[model samples]
Target: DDIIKNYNYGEINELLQENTWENFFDGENLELGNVLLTGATGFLGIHILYEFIKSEEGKIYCMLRKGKFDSCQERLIDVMNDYFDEDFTDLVGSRIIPIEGDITEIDDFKQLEDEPIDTVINSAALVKHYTADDYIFRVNVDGVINGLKFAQTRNNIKYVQISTISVLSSYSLNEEAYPNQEYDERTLYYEQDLENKYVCSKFLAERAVLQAATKGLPVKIIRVGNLMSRYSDGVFQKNYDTNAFLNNIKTIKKLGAMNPAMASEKVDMSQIDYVAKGILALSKTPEKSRVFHCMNNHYISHRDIVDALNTYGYGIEEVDFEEFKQIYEQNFEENVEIEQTVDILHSLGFDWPEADEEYLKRLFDYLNKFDYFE
Candidate 1:
C-alpha cells in the first residue's frame, strides 16, 4: 500500500464540500499592520521580511526556531548578512521583533495571541525533497493547521499561505488541464492524487487552509514558482546543494553539455524581489480570488541557459539524450543529491507556459558571478 493513500483524503474532501466562503473583505481596506512572519530566516522568507522593512512602517514579528544562535534577532541578522553579502542588522533595526517559536507546536503560537496581528504570512516550509514523509507532513500540513488556528484567534486576520508550484507537478500544461494561472476547483482532485511527499504535503496544507476558508477564515494561497536568484544580484539560494535548478546547472557545467531533450525543456524563473513584492501587493489589495500563481509567465528553456553559460565562458555544448546520460553517469560521482536533481529534471519534461527581456538579461549576467557548481 502506498504511504500517500494512508492520508485522510476522505476528511479533506469532506472539508472541501463545506459551505463556500462569504464575501469577507467586502468593504475594508486591508492593512499590513503588525505582521507575524514565520520562516523569516528562510530564502523567500528573508526576502519577504526585507520587502516589509523597505515598504511598511509596522512592526514585524518574526517567529523563529531556536537553534545554536543566542537570539532570534542574531540568527535573522546572520541570514540577512549572508544573503545580501553585507551588514543588514542596522537596516533591519528596531522594526523587527523576533519571537522564538516553532510552527509545528500549537502551544508555541499561543505566546503571540495577546499581540495585535493584522496579517500572518506563513512562509515557513520543509523544502527538502527526500526528507521522511512524516517530517514533511508535520511541518507543511500540521504547521498550516496551527497557523490557521492561530489566525482564527484574531478578528479578521489575513492568513497568507506560501505554497509551491510543485503541488501541480502531476498535471499536464495543456489548456484543458491548467487553463490559467488561477486555482481551479478541479485541480484539487489532481493535487490530492500527488505521489511525491513534498508536493502531497503542500497540497494537503492548501486543502486544510481552503477548508478553513470555507468556514470564514480569510486565507490567501500564493502558489510560487521556481524562485530564481534575486533580480538586484544573482545571489542564489544558500541551500543550492539541494536546489534542483542550481544542481542541474552545475551538472551541465561539469559535463560541458546538455541533452537536446532537456535543452528544449523550460523552467519558470520568477526573480525573488519581484515575487516577494508581488506577494505584498496581492496581500494588501483585497480580492475574492483565493489563489494566485506568483510565477513568471515567460519561461526560459535549458538552451537559453546554455547560450548564457557559453556567453559567460562556461562553454557548454549540445548532445543527444543517450550521450548526455552516458557522460553524466561516467563523469559525475554517484550521490543521492545529484540523482534527486536528475530525477526532478527528467520529470519536468518539455512543456512550459512561456519574461521581461531586460530582467532575463540581468539575470543571466548576475548568475554568471556565482560559482554554485563548486
Candidate 2:
C-alpha cells in the first residue's frame, strides 16, 4: 500500500483515464517520423539531434525555452561546433528547427500544435545538487505531464521519456522485466522508488508515463546512466556530475590523499554519442512501450579508475573503506574540499555493491573504444 501510495500513480491514472488516446502505433514499427526533442541545448540532446540529422530520416523540432529564434539557432550552432563535426553546420537550420517554449508551462507546447511532431523526446530536466523540490517536481514531473497532454493532441505521436536508472529500487545484473517491458506496478517496492529529489521526481514522471501508456499513449522510457564525453577525450560540458567526480579526483591527488569511496562502486558511463544513438535507435521502433537502461556493457569500478589515474600519472593513494573512513575522520575535518568529497561519497552510496553481472553487460560496447587507462 505504501509502495504504490508513494508514487501517486493511482491518482495520475484516474486523470489519465478521464482523457484517452487512440493507439495508432499498434503492431507497427515506426522507421521514420517527425520528432520534437526537448532540451536540445543539453549535451545528450545535442547528440540525439545530431543522430537524427545524420540519419536524415525526419525533421527534428528542437524545443526549448529560448528568448528568440536567431539566438537559439546561434546557441545550437555554437554547441554543435564544440561536440560535432564542422560539416554539421549545414544541417543546423535545415533539419533541426528551433522552438522557443517551456516544458513547465502547460500551454507552452501548444505552439507546436500547427507543426508536425509525430514523436516527442522529453529529455529536458532540471538537474543539480540542492535543487529545490518545487523546481525539480515542476520540470521533471509537471513538464512530463504537459508533454504527454501535448502528445494527446498530435496524431500518432510517440512519447520517449528520458528517465534514469536511479528510478529502479535495485539495478538488474540479469534481465528482468524492464525497458523491453514495463515493470509491473503490483511488484513495485517503496525502496525501488528512489527518494532523491531529482530521482523521486523522474521516477514519478515515469509512473505518470506508465499510467498514460496504459491509457494508450505510446511511451518509451530510457533510464540513462553516467555519460562520458562524446569522443572519450577530455571534451565535455563543465560542472556536470561526472566531470565533478573527475575534478574531485584531481583534488584528492593534489592533497596526496586516498579516497576509499572513489573505488567503492562502479559507474555505468556511456559516451554521449553512443547514448544518443541508443536513444534514437530505440525510438525508431514503437512495437511495445517499456523502460530500458541505456548503460554500457562493461562497468568501470573505482579501482579501475584508480589504475587509470595512476597510469595517467596521478600519484593518489587508493585506500579501502575502513582506512578511508579513519583517514577522513582524522584529516578531512578541517578541509572544506575533503569535506565536500566525503559528502559526495556518502550521498552517492560509493560503498554500494553491484547486482547480476550478466544483466549489467547486456548493453552495447561503448567502453571498448574508451580505455581510460591509456
Candidate 3:
C-alpha cells in the first residue's frame, strides 16, 4: 500500500495537471452548477477540492462533520491551514463553501438547497475497519442511497460515486490446470471466504451503484485502488490496516537494519500524488468510461525504492542482535520502533504467503501498462 501510495506517478501527474477541471465552467460562460463534494476533509478529498478550485469557477460545496471548537465551515479552513502550506492557499482559497450535514440522514444535504448544487462527487464512506454494523449500513449503504435521493430531487444533476478496487482486488489465483503463459491472470487474495465486512460492504455498494446506473440519472462509478497521497507522509500502512503496507517495509527494514544492505532490496514504496492524480484524470474522460485502473508502476520498481532510501543512508541489512541494535539506534529513524515487533512476528512462525517466482522483477516496469489511463 505504501508502495502504491508513493511511487504511483500517474496519480501525481493527473493531480498536477488539473486538466479535467478545464470544462468546469463549460467554456467559461458561467453555466456550471454548484459543485457538491463529500469527504473533502480527507486526504484525497482535500487535494481534489484544491484541484476543483484551481480548474473551475463554479461554487464548491463541502459536506463535513462538525468539530468541538468549530462548525463544519471552520473545520474546512482548519483542514486547509493544518495540512497545506500557506503558498497553496493562493491557488485554492476563495472557492470553497462548507455544508454541514451527515450522509446517513435522508435530508443531510438539505443545506445545499440554497447552494443549487447540480453535481456531487461523494468520497465519503462509513469505511473505518472497526465500524459497527449499524453505522456501516447507515453511512455507506444508506448514505449513498440518501445522497442519490437528494440528487434525484435536483434538475439536471450529475453524480459521481466513488468505490474501492477490492470489489475485484480480492480474487482467486489457483495454479491453472493448463499453462497458458499467454493469458495474464493473477489474483491478490486466495478465496472469496477470505473477504471480510469491508469487502462485502464495498461489493454491496458496487451493486447499488450499478442499479442506480440503470436509471436515467447521469452517474459515474469510480473504484479506487491503492490510494496514496502526501497525507500519509510515509506512514500510511500501519500493520493493523490490512489494505495498508506500512509494516511491510518496517518488517523488512527491521530485519535488514541489522546489516543495512540486503534490507533495502526487499521492499518498494509509492506516494499519494501518483495515485490521486490518476483518479482525477480518469474522472475527466468520457462518461460511463470502462472501469479504470488508477495506479503507477511503469517507471517504478522495488529496486528503485530500495535505492531511493539508500540516499538517506537508512538502508538496513540482517545482522546479529548486538550489532543490529547499534545500527538501529544510530542509523535508522527513531520512529521505526518495529525492530522488536518484527522480531516478535518472525518468531511466532505463522505460515506466511509465498511471493511470485519473478519476485526480483520491478513493479513499475509492469504497472505502466495499466497506467495509460492517467
Candidate 4:
C-alpha cells in the first residue's frame, strides 16, 4: 500500500551517473531567452508572466488550453487584466505569444519545435487537494512526462519544473538518519509514502523529471511553499472562493473565534510575487544542484495571524479547541467550501512559520484597506 516501495532510488542514481549534460549556466546572464511557459493563466503563472514582462525582453510563448475565450491570447489578456485590475494587454503588447495546446498531449508540444525556444518552464498543475487520482496523475505526472519529452527535442534547452513543498510530508517517516530533524535544500531524496493524491502526483512528477535529468537533460526542480497574496496590493487568486486558507478566514470571521491550540503551529507561506521572482532568478542561475527550495526562510505562526486579525479590528477571540468545535457544530452553516476548509483545518492545524516584517505589514494594510475581515 505504501507508494515509497515503488520508488527505485538505486536505478535513478545509476542513470544519474551516466548523465552527459554539462552545466550551462555561467552565473552572469539574467536574460531568459525565448521561453515556453506553461500555465500562463494560473495564479503563479500570471505573476511569472508579469515578471517576464517587467524584467525580461525576450518573447514568452505561453502554452494554454483553448476554448475559454476566442483565442489563447484573449484568455491570457483577460486573466492578466483580472489579476492586475487594469489594462494588462498594453504592457504585454506582442512579446507574449499564446499557443493553444494542452500539456497532456505530447503531440501538442511539437507546434513550438520550429520556434527558437531556449527554455521550458513547466508550471501547469492540478492543484486541488481532493481531486481524483486519475485526474491529478494525468496533469501532474503525465503532463510533466510530455514536457520532458518536448524539452529533449531541442538540444541544450533548459527545463525548469515548478514543484511543491507538500512533497516533503512523508520525509520524517522515510528518512532513517534524519528521523526528527528538519529538512533543507541539501536533503537527499527518499522514498515518500504520500497519501494525498495531489502530493503523490507531484512526487512522481519530480521523479520523472529527475530521471530525465539523469539522462542528460539540463533541468531544475523548484520546490515552492504555500503562496500568499501579493505583497504590494494583497491581490489574491482569482478562485479565492474555493481557496481553503481564505475560506477558513471567512469561516473564522463568521464564528468570531479561533482555537488557541493551533497558535504555535508554523504556516509556510511566501509572497506570491517574491515566489515568482525567485523562480525566475533561480531558473536563470542553474547550478550543479538540480533541486532548489524557493520558500520564505522566516514564517509567521498562527498566533501572529490572530494578533494581526485583532490589530485589524476583527476582534477574533481565542477559544479552546473543544469550545470552538462546539460553536462550529452548533451554529456554522454547512456548505462545500466550509466543509472542505474544516476538513483541511482538522487534518493540518493552522500555523505560519515566518514571513518578512515589511511584507506582512503591507499585506495587513491591503487586507484592512479592502475590509477583508468584514
Q: What is the per-residue lDDT of model 3 for residues 49-78, given as tens digits with 9 covering 90 to 100?
A: 766665566778888778774777667877
Query: For candidate 4, lDDT tens digit of each residue in 77-136?
Result: 888888886576764547888898989999899888888888889899998889744888
lDDT of 1 by residue, 122-164 (tens): 9999987776548888899999999999998866688999987
Per model, how many backbone clashes are there? Answer: 2, 6, 25, 10
Q: Which is superior by TM-score, 2 or 4?
A: 4
> What TM-score does each of the candidates earn?
0.79, 0.73, 0.62, 0.82
Please tell me which model should have the higher TM-score, number 1 or number 2.
Answer: 1
Best by TM-score: 4
| Ranking of models by lDDT | 4, 1, 2, 3
Candidate 1 shows a clash count of 2
lDDT of 2 by residue, 61-158 (tens): 98775455467777677777866655566666667787777888888887888988788998899776456547888889999999999998855888
Task: State the weakest 10-residue window (summed lDDT) of model 1.
Answer: 332-341
